[PDB]
Paper text:
In the present study we report the discovery and the structural characterization of two novel flavoprotein oxidases from the thermophilic fungus M. thermophila. In both MtVAO615 and MtVAO713 the cofactor FAD is covalently tethered to the protein by covalent linkages.
The final R-factors are 19.8/23.9 (Rcryst/Rfree). Cys222 in MtVAO615 is substituted for Ser231 in MtVAO713. The groove to the substrate binding pocket of MtVAO713 is broader than of MtVAO615 and is delimited by Tyr100, Leu161, Ser231, His246, Tyr352, Phe354, Leu425, Asp427, Ile435, Ser433, Val469, Leu471, Ile501 and Glu543. The active site opposite to the FAD is very hydrophobic and is lined by several leucines and isoleucines. The hydrophobic nature of these residues is in line with the identified substrate ricinoleic acid, which is a very hydrophobic compound. Despite having a monocovalent FAD, the active site of MtVAO713 is rather open, similar to bicovalent flavoproteins.
Author numbering: 27 to 598
């Protein structure tokens, strides 16, 4: 049976009549022949400068990118760039690249069954997308048939008391739940949680999918320190296997599959629905806004980075005190970042469940450590109190930031013991700060600790062990030009993987990274992404998808195949 999937233009590729008959079986209009988002910017039959300008204007918008079957928030390889003609830009070339060639706009189980079956029947690579949010190309594939789940939406329903499809009691959970009965986004789930005065533990941005890559890789957000990571919210799922069977996965049934999807990434089956734990609303949340800038701005920014190193050392104490959230910093920035300075550190942290007085005590270990820098840095610190989770969430989080660039980042979970020696930390900070000429994004995800640590007791979970000891994640990355030569991308990828990523590993060598926002070019990605759970993830992969119908890049088992950006996917 053939080692390589069939691709367009080959003799094995179904001819126009076969595709047309497949469109008609589905329901005319469901099969979409994909077109590069910005093809109207280029010469040929599809050229349209009005369409091109609209596309150029809307490229950075998350909804615009989720609305097209091959729209990508963080496109893995821009092979058809939008062209800004008003700005004097001119076209190079436009190809599909590694984006799927056909998509099925699937809105019923029958759509999904037929798409799965057709892919297998014609040996065509099946690509699964709920939203196209992925940063690593795991919802892409050259010459692929995309199962697009964006309109597969059969309700989001609140359960006052979790009620399992197979009456499983082994979760031990008798609290409330939400049945996410479709490939909904967090926005949709949040509306129902809010209507029912409960906390749904979703992402900091509401556009990503609720039941796909987000929970399967981990899933962080404002509420995860307090209530657990996204993967650990999952009580059960309905999943269509490669063989077409629809099965329940929970503590009582196919528990190896259930564990795999809760931390082992995508590619075990097509997730049709999940049930998630939801949590009682709180009476208070206080947010802490901190900003730090140099009094004396220089290319080295020695004092700023000293303080950032110190701040990193304070995070575990903060985490132990119920503090969570996100911090952002730059050694150099192309313009004012903190007040008047073209550099600095800023964060939005919070104590869910605590009023301001307790919030101030919670961050005291950090503010006290920062008193030593009052002569050297300008530091501002404010608190905002909210009377429930949702007013807090929408005020301090619920982000819809600009997107549309390639992601080249590395992530490293940091254990407390990696931070006790200031000099080692300072050295890590020096390297990840990057070259003063090159913009380096550095981000702190203070999203673990607390309940995430506690949920180590849950052996049904598949989450990377390092989550259970690491209260926060460091992410460091750089951009590439929109139209990027191979040489420039290899230079940047090397800085991210072997300079930035390497420093982070040296700082914390016993932990790992975060697959969803992580380094897909790391030679050691298996270790980073999955850790010691990998052998068990792989077993589930080989049991439930022996033919690797759900192949994705870096996903468990992907090393048994060779992916190309411009040719057939093949088994080794
Ligand atoms: C603007 C933006 C903001 C973000 N914010 C956050 C954040 O705050 N916190 C955080 O942790 N992450 C965040 N992410 C990252 C997100 O967790 C990952 O990109 C994740 O892969 C998104 O899953 P998705 O289904 O939405 O993406 P997709 O690209 O649709 O799919 C991602 C992967 O999951 C697979 N997949 C999707 N749906 C299914 C399914 N139903 N069954 C089987 N496999 C499936 C795909 O095959 C692919 O491998 C953000 C991403 C974007 C674009
Ligand atoms: C982005 O897409 C381009 C175009 O498909 C890829 O370039 C090809 O890469 C292979 C090696 O992997 C070469 O043998 C081809 O000659 C390249 N083609 C062209 C037209 O340049 C590129 O590899 C993709 N980048 C990534 C990181 O996936
Ligand atoms: C996808 O299908 C739904 C109906 O199931 C329809 O409302 C929607 O507009 C379709 N989208 C596209 C892009 O064809």
């Amino acid at each position: 049976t053939p080692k390589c999937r069939c691709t367009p233009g080959e003799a094995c590729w179904p001819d126009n009549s076969v595709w047309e008959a497949f469109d008609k079986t589905l329901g005319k209009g469901k099969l979409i022949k994909t077109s590069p988002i910005a093809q109207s910017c280029y010469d040929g039959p599809q050229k349209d400068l009005d369409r091109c300008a609209y596309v150029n204007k809307m490229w950075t918008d998350q909804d615009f990118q989720t609305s097209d079957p091959i729209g990508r928030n963080y496109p893995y390889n821009i092979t058809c760039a939008p062209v800004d003609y008003a700005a004097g830009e001119t076209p190079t070339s436009c190809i599909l690249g590694s984006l799927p060639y056909y998509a099925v706009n699937a809105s019923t189980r029958e759509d999904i069954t037929l798409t799965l079956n057709f892919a297998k029947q014609h040996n065509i690579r099946l690509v699964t997308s709920s939203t196209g949010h992925d940063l690593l190309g795991r919802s892409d594939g050259y010459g692929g048939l995309e199962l697009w789940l964006h309109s597969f939406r059969n309700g989001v329903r609140f359960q006052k008391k979790y009620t399992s499809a197979n009456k499983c009691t082994k979760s031990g959970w008798t609290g409330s739940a939400i049945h996410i009965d479709g490939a909904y986004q967090w926005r949709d789930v949040y509306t129902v949680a809010q209507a029912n005065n409960v906390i749904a533990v979703g992402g900091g941005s509401p556009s990503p999918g609720a039941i796909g890559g987000w929970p399967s890789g981990g899933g962080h957000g404002p509420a995860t320190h307090n209530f657990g990571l996204g993967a650990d919210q999952v009580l059960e799922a309905q999943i269509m296997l490669a063989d077409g069977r629809i099965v329940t996965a929970n503590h009582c049934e196919n528990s190896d599959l259930f564990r795999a999807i809760r931390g082992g990434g995508p590619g075990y089956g097509i997730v049709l629905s999940q049930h998630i734990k939801v949590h009682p609303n709180v009476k208070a949340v206080t947010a802490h806004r901190l900003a730090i800038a140099p009094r004396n701005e220089t290319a080295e920014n020695k004092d700023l980075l000293d303080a950032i190193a110190v701040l990193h050392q304070q995070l575990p104490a903060l985490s132990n005190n119920g503090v969570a959230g996100y911090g952002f910093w730059f050694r150099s920035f192309p313009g004012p970042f903190v007040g008047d300075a073209h550099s600095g550190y800023t964060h939005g942290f919070w104590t869910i469940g605590k009023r301001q007085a307790e919030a101030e005590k919670a961050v005291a270990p950090l503010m006290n450590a920062l008193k030593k820098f009052e002569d050297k840095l300008v530091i501002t610190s404010t608190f905002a109190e909210y009377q429930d989770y949702w007013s807090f969430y929408w005020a301090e989080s619920g982000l819809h930031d600009p997107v549309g660039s390639t992601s080249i980042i590395t992530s490293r979970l940091i254990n407390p013991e990696a931070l006790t020696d200031y000099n080692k930390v300072r050295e890590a900070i020096e390297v990840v700060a990057g070259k003063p000429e090159e913009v380096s994004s550095n981000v702190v995800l203070l999203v673990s600790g607390g309940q995430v640590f506690k949920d180590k007791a849950d052996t049904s979970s598949g989450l990377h062990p390092a989550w259970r000891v690491s209260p926060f994640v460091m992410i460091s990355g750089q951009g590439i030009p929109k139209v990027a030569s191979r040489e420039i991308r290899d230079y940047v990828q090397h800085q991210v993987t072997h300079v930035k990523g390497a420093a982070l590993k040296k700082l914390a060598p016993n932990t790992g990274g975060y697959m969803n926002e992580g380094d897909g070019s790391d030679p050691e990605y298996i270790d980073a992404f999955y850790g010691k759970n990998y052998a068990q993830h792989l077993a589930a992969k080989r049991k439930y998808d022996p033919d690797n119908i759900f192949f994705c890049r870096t996903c468990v088992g992907a090393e048994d195949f060779i992916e190309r950006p411009d040719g057939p996917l093949c088994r080794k």
